[PDB]
Amino acid sequence: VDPTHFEKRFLKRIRDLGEGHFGKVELCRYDPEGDNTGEQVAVKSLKPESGGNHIADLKKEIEILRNLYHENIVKYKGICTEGIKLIMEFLPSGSLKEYLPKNKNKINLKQQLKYAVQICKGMDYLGSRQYVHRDLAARNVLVESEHQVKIGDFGLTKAIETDKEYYTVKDDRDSPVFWYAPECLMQSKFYIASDVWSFGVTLHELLTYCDSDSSPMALFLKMIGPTHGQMTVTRLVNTLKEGKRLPCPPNCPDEVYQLMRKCWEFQPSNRTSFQNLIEGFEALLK
Ligand SMILES: C=Cc1cc(F)c(CN2CC[C@](CC#N)(n3cc(C(N)=O)c(NC(=O)OC)n3)[C@H](F)C2)cc1O
Numbered sequence: 001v002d003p004t005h006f007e008k009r010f011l012k013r014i015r016d017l018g019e020g021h022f023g024k025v026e027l028c029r030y031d032p033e034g035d036n037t038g039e040q041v042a043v044k045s046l047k048p049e050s051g052g053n054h055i056a057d058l059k060k061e062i063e064i065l066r067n068l069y070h071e072n073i074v075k076y077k078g079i080c081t082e083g084i085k086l087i088m089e090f091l092p093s094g095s096l097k098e099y100l101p102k103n104k105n106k107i108n109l110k111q112q113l114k115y116a117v118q119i120c121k122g123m124d125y126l127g128s129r130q131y132v133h134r135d136l137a138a139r140n141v142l143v144e145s146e147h148q149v150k151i152g153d154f155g156l157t158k159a160i161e162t163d164k165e166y167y168t169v170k171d172d173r174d175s176p177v178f179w180y181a182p183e184c185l186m187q188s189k190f191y192i193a194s195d196v197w198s199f200g201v202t203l204h205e206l207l208t209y210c211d212s213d214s215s216p217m218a219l220f221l222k223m224i225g226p227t228h229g230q231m232t233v234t235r236l237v238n239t240l241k242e243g244k245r246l247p248c249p250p251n252c253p254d255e256v257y258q259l260m261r262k263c264w265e266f267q268p269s270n271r272t273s274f275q276n277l278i279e280g281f282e283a284l285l286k
Pocket of ligand 1: 019020022024026042044045046074088089090091092093094095118137140141142151152153154155156265269275
């Protein structure tokens with residue numbers, strides 16, 4: 001028996017956990033014994049279509065996640081082969097986006113900063129292994145417990161070539177533009193420092209308990225105009241070049257806001273590092 005080999009005949013679909021353009025993530029029970037006692041798992045699969053081989057990308061995502069081992073990175077469980085399905089642990093609390101709005105009374109600033117540290121430890125591990133995530137947002141941060149988060153999705157993750165500072169693409173811009181650094185929006189280049197920018201926006205989300213009326217998309221559209229359509233991104237790049245940033249979350253101490261501002265230095269080289277963030281948060285927690 002290979003315990004990472006999940007037979008289709010035993011993998012029972014329960015419900016959708018999410019959708020994207022090219023695929024979905026479903027709650028399944030792997031129930032070899034057929035009595036509903038099998039373990040619940042999360043299952044990423046492509047909708048039958050995926051031309052610009054989404055299959056090749058999913059296979060590379062599976063290979064990335066199989067070889068990540070960190071307590072703040074969602075666990076690989078295995079595959080289901082037919083087309084292929086990525087099986088992961090199921091975290092029934094879901095993302096910070098579903099959990100924080102329901103648990104503000106539970107999650108105070110101290111716990112928010114611990115979650116901030118744990119995201120940074122995840123992200124520093126992925127950086128150490130020469131990857132750029134390119135999609136760091138609260139919707140991609142899963143709640144293991146009141147005390148623990150894990151980065152839960154690697155759909156856009158890429159290897160930076162050895163002796164390169166960044167990864168270029170212009171694949172499929174369903175891009176999360178309200179999470180992206182200017183060098184990402186302007187020149188489709190992604191540095192580790194780009195994920196640090198993305199982390200500052202995710203920190204803002206965590207500090208606003210992912211309220212939809214304070215979302216980075218809501219607040220940016222207020223700054224530039226909810227109009228604009230095909231002009232949005234320029235207008236956003238314009239806003240950033242003028243030095244405009246997301247405002248301090250209500251009740252966020254200036255010293256936390258100042259760590260978030262260091263994520264948002266226009267030049268990648270001018271940005272804080274994940275290691276420095278962990279230090280600044282740990283300082284604030286003592
Ligand atoms: C084909 C590509 C593709 C498809 C997609 F649907 C998504 C979108 N997506 C990612 C995984 C997601 C969020 C995270 N992190 N999630 C994982 C779990 C879990 N493992 O338990 C979970 N739990 C949950 O909601 O519990 C109530 N949510 C959620 F499914 C959304 C991204 C993609 O690249």
